[PDB]
Amino acid sequence: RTQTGNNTTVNIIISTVDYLLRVQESISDFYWYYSGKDVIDEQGQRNFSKAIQVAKQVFNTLTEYIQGPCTGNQQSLAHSRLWDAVVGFLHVFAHMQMKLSQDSSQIELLKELMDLQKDMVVMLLSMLEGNVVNGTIGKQMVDMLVESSNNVEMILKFFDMFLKLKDLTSSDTFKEYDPDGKGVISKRDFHKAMESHKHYTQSETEFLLSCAETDENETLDYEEFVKRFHEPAKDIGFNVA
Amino acid sequence: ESTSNSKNVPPDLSICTFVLEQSLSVRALQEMLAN
């Protein structure tokens, strides 16, 4: 942060945040290019993967700067442009989570993206590490949340409708819809399972249907389904909570 | 409308005021225009 002895001081902690903002803007533009398109091509999938790796490494460096609470570094990030980058990442996460889930060919991209989100939340938690009541960092994070309210609402609904999926699949009504314990259920039986559960509305039921991949046999592997859409939900949602 | 000579000639800001409705990105605006 500050080279005390040296005649001239350079703020590496701020330069890192600056690069983070630049890469976030690049990723946001490269997503806005693909928002209209139905399917992301292989080249696009590779480019997202490389950009997500770079952003993940930058987030890890930023959280290494501040863990083991470094008050100076925490204040520098608080007064830097970190909030602007986090706002853009929140929008990208809120929309790409709803987009990539429907397509069954972007499982790896979704997994990389939902690990980038976990690293971002870990960095945010490290920012609040060693907080005081009515702190400036708390005020700025509340401001950033208020600015990105809608994106967080969409993320939280995405997490909730998948955290309820474990209860649905562990319910006994599911067991009497699928008497065998093999773990393979038909799409119609899964639909009537959601309908009998009644904690899912029509929109959530149809979205779960769209995000569920079924073969020509009109059946799917709901254990694999609930896994892919539950453990990332379970850990990211815990960090957010 | 001249506002430098406010002491001698009153300015008519009523027809100079504008309001900012929307601030969209270039990509979003192009997509909307395409739609």
At residue A184, the 3 state secondary structure works out as strand
**Residue B25: its chain A contacts at CB < 8 A?**
32
Cα A37–A39–A42 angle (5° rounding)?
120
Shortest Cα–Cα distance, B5 to chain A (Å): 41
Q: At which residue do the structure tokens 């060919």 appear?
A: A105
DSSP 8-class letter at A214: -
CA A199 to CA A186: how far, in whole Å? 20
Chain B, nearest residue to A29 by Cα: B27
CB count in 10 Å sphere of residue A163: 15
Closest CA relative to residue A119, chosen from A176, A165, A62: A62
Beta bridge partners of A184: A221
CB neighbour list of residue A156: distance below 8 Å, 6 or more residues apart? A237, A240
**By the 8 A CB rule, do A190 and A229 touch?**
no
CB environment A113-142: b (16+ within 10 A), e (fewer): bbbbbbbbbbbbebbeeeeeeeeebeebbe
Q: Name which of B25, B27, B33 to mutate to probe chain A: the one with the most chain A Cβ atoms within 10 A of its Cβ.
A: B27
Phi-psi region of A134 (alpha: psi -120 to 50; beta: other; left: phi over 0): left
Closest CA relative to residue A69, chosen from A150, A132, A7, A126: A126
Closest CA relative to residue A239, chosen from A166, A159, A165: A159
Beta bridge partners of A185: A220
Cα A160–A111–A216 angle (5° rounding)?
85
**Residue B31: its chain A contacts at CB < 8 A?**
35-36
Q: At which residue do the structure tokens 């406010």 appear?
A: B6
CB neighbour list of residue A144: distance below 8 Å, 6 or more residues apart? A83, A86, A87
CB environment A86-98: b (16+ within 10 A), e (fewer): bbbbbbbbbbbbe
**By the 8 A CB rule, do A55 and A20 touch?**
yes
CA A114 to CA A97: how far, in whole Å? 8
Shortest Cα–Cα distance, B13 to chain A (Å): 32
Beta bridge partners of A221: A184
Query: How many residues are present in chain B?
Result: 35
Sign of CA dihedral A148, A153, A156, A157: negative
End-to-end CA distance of chain B: 38
**Residue A33: its chain B contacts at CB < 8 A?**
27
CA A230 to CA A224: how far, in whole Å? 10
Query: Chain A to chain B, count of Cβ pairs less than 8 Å apart?
Result: 7
At residue A221, the 3 state secondary structure works out as strand
Which token pair is A92?
């990208």
- How was this entry determined? cryo-EM
CA A3 to CA A26: how far, in whole Å? 31
Q: In terms of C-beta density within 10 A (0-12 exposed, 13-18 middle, 19 or more buried), how is residue A27 classed?
A: buried
Listing DSSP states for B1-35 in one string gives: ---TTTTTS---GGGT---------HHHHHHHHH-
**By the 8 A CB rule, do A240 and A154 touch?**
no
Beta bridge partners of A219: A186
CB neighbour list of residue A115: distance below 8 Å, 6 or more residues apart? A56, A232
CA B1 to CA A233: how far, in whole Å? 59
Side chain identity, residue A19: Y
CA B8 to CA A26: how far, in whole Å? 52
Q: In terms of C-beta density within 10 A (0-12 exposed, 13-18 middle, 19 or more buried), how is residue B22 classed?
A: exposed
Q: Name which of A28, A32, A34 to mutate to probe chain B: the one with the most chain B Cβ atoms within 10 A of its Cβ.
A: A32
DSSP 8-class letter at A186: E
Q: Do A35 and B25 touch (CB under 8 A)?
A: no
CB neighbour list of residue A231: distance below 8 Å, 6 or more residues apart? none
Interface of B with A in 14-33 (CB under 8 A): 25, 27-28, 31
Shortest Cα–Cα distance, B17 to chain A (Å): 27
Q: At which residue do the structure tokens 């590490």 appear?
A: A129
Largest alpha-carbon pair distance within chain B? 51
CA A155 to CA A113: how far, in whole Å? 13
